[PDB]
Design a protein around this ligand. Sequence first.
Ligand SMILES: CS(=O)(=O)c1ccc(N2CCNCC2)cc1NC(=O)c1cccc2ncccc12
Lengths: 156, 39
Amino acid sequence: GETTDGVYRVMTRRLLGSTQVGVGVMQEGVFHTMWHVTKGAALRSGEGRLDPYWGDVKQDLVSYCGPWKLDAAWDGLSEVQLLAVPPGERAKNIQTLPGIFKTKDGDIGAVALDYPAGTSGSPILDKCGRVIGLYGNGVVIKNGSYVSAITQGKRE
Amino acid sequence: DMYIERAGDITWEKDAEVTGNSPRLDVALDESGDFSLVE
Ligand SMILES: CS(=O)(=O)c1ccc(N2CCNCC2)cc1NC(=O)c1cccc2ncccc12
């Protein structure tokens, strides 16, 4: 399969035509997406097969072909870019200053941007081009607007 | 069977479009990976 680094669409033909269910990141030979996009199923790339390697329903993350590779963190100060890949539309950078999710287990960066559900797993980057996490898990607020965490996995 | 298609390189792009606010939200995270607003 195609193992070039970068951002990929995740598609299914199990529905009408070809439907984009989400997005993910190829880095160091490993495919990274949100658990809720694949539910941990295998993926095709050409006639290549990607098997799940690691997942966590609570983190809502999954890796294919090896361990989670993405270890950059939001600085807590500086703007970030959501590299949004919406269904049937080109990759588009959207620059924003994250808010905070406050939890009993600590503070998490969060982005207040509203994109189709099929954008689930698009990467959030820092000024140096590093993936600080994945968009598409969060919350609907008083306004009926969507705020996503900056969801990041642990590297061993 | 789900399949993947390459959509782009991962780069910072200068003069992107700039939008969204920065809310401070009290949230809880359940065992099913669902976040919710605490009030
Ligand atoms: C509808 S979905 O297939 O994308 C989906 C399925 C499942 C989940 N899960 C449920 C259990 N495990 C944790 C999370 C989340 C999602 N994402 C969303 O619903 C969504 C993603 C982006 C943006 C949004 N904006 C507004 C509302 C919603 C969204």
